Ligand SMILES: NC(=O)C1=CN([C@@H]2O[C@H](COP(=O)(O)OP(=O)(O)OC[C@H]3O[C@@H](n4cnc5c(N)ncnc54)[C@@H](OP(=O)(O)O)[C@@H]3O)[C@@H](O)[C@H]2O)C=CC1
């Protein structure tokens with residue numbers, strides 16, 4: 001009991017794979033955040049009685065989210081950290097690795113329990129993404145591609161959209177994205193505050 005679910009990674013990144021600048025996001029993208037929330041939150045209606053999605057995040061990502069938005073509402077939050085928090089203890093799930101998080105969620109949210117887990121998301125940390133790209137249950141990347149070389153100091157660790165990884169990672173038809181995300185989603189370039197981005201969904205075979 002531990003191999004059940006695929007992991008999905010969700011990320012926004014520039015075409016040079018930049019994702020972060022001063023333990024923050026190098027952009028301010030109200031719509032993009034709104035997609036993140038909607039993807040990360042969606043549970044099919046029949047399952048929305050009992051089921052919640054899970055968001056897994058590195059410790060530096062936890063801190064870098066404005067305090068008023070923590071925990072991410074309507075999703076089971078787990079922060080990955082070797083400490084043995086200390087979190088500020090406080091009823092926010094904690095684990096020292098991606099697999100220790102999964103084990104905790106299965107123990108905590110089992111057949112028995114009131115709440116049921118629907119999908120599991122890795123929402124970041126470059127360090128946590130690195131561990132997720134190595135994990136053999138990671139089969140899906142919901143990527144927002146930012147068409148600008150915004151200066152970054154933290155990078156996505158694997159060039160999954162580049163030719164050297166193109167036999168492993170495959171970009172899906174937009175209708176397959178909408179279908180996976182349960183909603184109609186903007187297709188093509190979107191422009192908030194000065195640059196174009198778009199929503200992509202990438203997969204690999206387990
Ligand atoms: N553009 C986007 O889509 C997103 C960008 N970001 C950005 O990425 C940056 C943060 O990335 P990064 O600095 O790497 O930090 P992370 O958010 O991955 O947090 C790093 C810390 O998380 C714990 N951790 C992460 N991975 C593991 C692991 N495999 N095993 C055990 N513990 C782990 C910490 O442990 P310990 O307690 O020991 O410190 C480690 O120091 C920020 O700028 C943030 O804004 C974040 C989310 C999304």
Ligand SMILES: COc1ccc(OCCCCCC(=O)O)cc1Cc1cnc2nc(N)nc(N)c2c1C
Pocket residue numbers: 010011012023024025032033036037061064065066069072073122123124143144
């Ligand atoms: C540094 O990470 C930040 C910094 C500030 C921030 O502003 C608060 C918004 C919270 C309200 C929405 C909700 O309730 O969900 C959010 C995040 C997380 C984030 C943002 N975009 C994201 N966009 C994508 N494509 N992927 C991610 N993984 C994102 C992730 C983790």
